[PDB]
Each structure stands twice: as structure tokens, then as C-alpha cells.
Amino acid sequence: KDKEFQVLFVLTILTLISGTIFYSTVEGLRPIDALYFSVVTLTTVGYGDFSPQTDFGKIFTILYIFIGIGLVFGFIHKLAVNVQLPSILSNLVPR
Amino acid sequence: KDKEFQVLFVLTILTLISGTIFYSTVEGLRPIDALYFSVVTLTTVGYGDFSPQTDFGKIFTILYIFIGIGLVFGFIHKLAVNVQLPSILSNLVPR
Amino acid sequence: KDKEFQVLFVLTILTLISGTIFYSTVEGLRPIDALYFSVVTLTTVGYGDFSPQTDFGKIFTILYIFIGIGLVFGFIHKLAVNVQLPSILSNLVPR
Amino acid sequence: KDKEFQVLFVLTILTLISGTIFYSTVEGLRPIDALYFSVVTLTTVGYGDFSPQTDFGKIFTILYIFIGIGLVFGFIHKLAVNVQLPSILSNLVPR
Ligand SMILES: [K+]
Ligand SMILES: [K+]
Ligand SMILES: [K+]
Ligand SMILES: [K+]
């Protein structure tokens, strides 16, 4: 239900926090930029305004992408179908 | 039906208008560039020829991506299967 | 069958040719670069080593993305399940 | 089963090795950077911190994308549903 969505939501934020912590400390980004970069990476947008410069960070980025894309897109999907779609249908009821 | 497609179409344009308004005013882009950037972002292409420079804009971009990807890809999917696919089948009928 | 795959294949190449023609003439790219850019765009990789510089090209790029992503990913999907998957299963048979 | 996952895993690494070999030798990247670039490309992130500079490499990149995206996203999907999802459910059992 909503708890399915809530758990995915929590997993997704924890995953984004891990990236924030990693890119803040290993790659020297401000926490806000490391969060923003983590999001841009796992949603596969990839502006490239930020990207890892160290070998450690490139290796982490490889694993982070493979492990986090599946979760992040699972969350977007549940966001879309269990939250945005009901809300839309609700907003379409005429009164 | 077609109204399902029409509603998604309207929601998608309204979402792209929101990004146009936000990136035009907060990030200083020409309206055309803010529209183009919004599209490039939510379809996950992400050239990076444009990207947010302010902290406010990076935070908005985080939320805009998570909220808009699901809708935009729902629309592309309905575009593909309820409009392009029938039109293709129609264009394959021999006479 | 295979003709389903063949038609999608033809549609996809015709779509990539349209982008090649457009970006070669309107954006001044070498045909090879315009083809490469069209592919990078519709598969949503978006390196940004190329991106449209004119207003005409940005507008075309908006429409090209929305119209071409659905087809290109339909083709990759049929490539994956009707061609690569059988070939893999075939290559797994022990003799 | 797990062997389905194991085979996809092997195919995916072999595909990433092919890109590593190609971009290391034809494009002159360090092996680590060619591996990192191959991953960033086939998951469709596409930072553009690296991108092919030679005509040979752009042509290979076209084919590599079309052939490798389907496999890489098949693997992420099986990673997500046959490995991460069971592990999550397991980690949710109360004791
Ligand atoms: K991308
Ligand atoms: K980029
Ligand atoms: K992408
Ligand atoms: K990109």
C-alpha cells in the first residue's frame, strides 16, 4: 500500500544520503552539490556539471549506478502509479 | 481513449511550462532555453549545455526530476502505443 | 515476427536519417557527427559533446526527442527480446 | 533462477570488458576510464566528461549503445527484482 511507497521512499533517501556522504568527503563537493549530483546520476540525466575526478570515486560511481538505478526507478514508478495517478483522478472528478 | 492521451498531453505541457517559468526567472534563461532545458532534463537526455547554477535551482531541479520523469515517460509511452503505433499500422495497409 | 523487428528497424533508421539531415544542414554538423548526435540524443545518453546552438534546432530537438524516444526504445526492446535473447539461448545449448 | 541472474551478470561484464578494450586502445583512455566511460554510456547517464573523438570510435559507440543498452537494463532489472527485492524483504522481517 502506502507503506510499500513509504519504504521505497525511505530506501531512496538513504541511497541518496550515501551518495551525498561519499561525494562530499571523497570528491570534495558541498553536501548540496553531492546530493544534487547523486540525484542527477541515478535518474540517468547526467548533466556532467559534476563528475568524479578520482579513481576511487569513479569506481564507486560504477557500483552506485548499478545498485541505485533499479531502486530509484522503482520509486519513480510507485510515485507515478500509487500517488500521482490517484491524485490526478481525484483532481478530475467534476463537482 | 484519446482523452486519456489528451489529459497526459495537457499535464505534460503544464509541467514543461512550470519549468519554463522557474528556470526563466530564477536561473535567468531565455524562455526558449528554459523550455528546451526542461525537456532535456525530464526526458533524461541531460546534455548539460544548461544546468542550474544557484542553490535554489538545484533543489528545485531535484524535485522537478522526481515529479516530472514519471509523467513525461507516461506520456511518451501513451504517445508511442495509442498514437504512433495505430498510425504506423494504418500506414502499412496495402492498397 | 522478424518482420515486426524489420519494420521497427527501418523506422528507426529513417528516424536517425531525418536527424542526420536536419542537424547536418541546420546545425552545420558533419553527417557522421549529426548521425552520432541523433543516436546519443534519442537513446537519452546525451554527452553534450554536441548540442543545438540555434533556436530552430532547439525547437526541432524538443519535438525530435518526444517523437523518437518511443520508437528507439521500442526497437531496443524488440532487439533485446526477439533477437539477442534467442541468440543467447542458442549459444547456451551444450553439445 | 540465480543462474539466470549469473548469466546476465557475466554477459554484462563481458560487454563492459569489450568497451574497456575498445576505448582503451582506439580512444587512448586509461583502462579504468574506459570501463567507467562504458558504464556511464550503457546506463544512459552520459556525463560527457569522456566521449569518443575519432570517427571509428563514434561509429563503434553508435553500435555499442544499441547492442548494450538492452542487456545492461535487463541486468539492472534482474538485479532489482531477483536480488535486491528479496534481500529487502528479508531485511524487513521482524524478530
Ligand atoms: K543522460
Ligand atoms: K552531459
Ligand atoms: K538517460
Ligand atoms: K547526459
Author numbering:
A (entry chain A), B (entry chain A), C (entry chain A), D (entry chain A): 20 to 114
Direct quotes from the study:
Potassium ion (K+) channels are highly selective membrane protein pores and operate with near diffusion limited efficacy. Their high selectivity and flow rates allow them to function as critical elements in electrically excitable cells, such as neurons, muscle cells, and endocrine cells, facilitating the use of electricity in biological organisms. Each subunit contributes a linear backbone consisting of five or six residues with their carbonyl groups pointing inward to generate a fourfold symmetrical binding pore.
The correlation between the atomic displacement parameters (ADPs) and the occupancy of an atom coupled with the inability to distinguish between electron density of a K+ ion and that of a water molecule make anomalous diffraction studies necessary. To fully understand the characteristics of K+ movement in a single file through the channel, we have experimentally determined the number of K+ ions within a selectivity filter, using anomalous X-ray diffraction. Despite the long wavelength of λ = 3.35 Å the data was of high quality allowing the crystallographic phase problem to be solved by K-SAD. Using the SAD data directly, we were able to refine the occupancy of the four K+ ions within the ion channel in each of two protein molecules (subunit A and subunit B) present in the crystallographic asymmetric unit, with the phenix.refine program. Each K+ ion within the selectivity filter is shared between four unit cells and thus has a maximum occupancy value of 0.25. All of the four K+ ions in the channel refine to occupancy values close to the maximum possible value (0.25) with ADPs that are almost identical to the oxygen atoms located at the sides of the ion channel with which they are interacting. Phenix.refine refines occupancies and ADP (or B-factors) separately at all times. After refinement, the occupancy values for all the K+ ions in the channel clustered around 0.25, suggesting that all four K+ binding sites in the NaK2K selectivity filter are fully occupied with K+ ions. The high K+ ion refined occupancies at all sites in the selectivity filter indicate that all sites are fully occupied with K+ ions with a total of four K+ ions being present within the selectivity filter at a K+ ion concentration of 100 mM. These results suggest that water is not co-translocated with K+ ions, which is seemingly in disagreement with ion/water co-translocation ratios determined from earlier experiments. However, it is in total agreement with earlier molecular dynamics simulations and crystallographic data analysis, suggesting that ion transport occurs via direct coulomb knock-on.
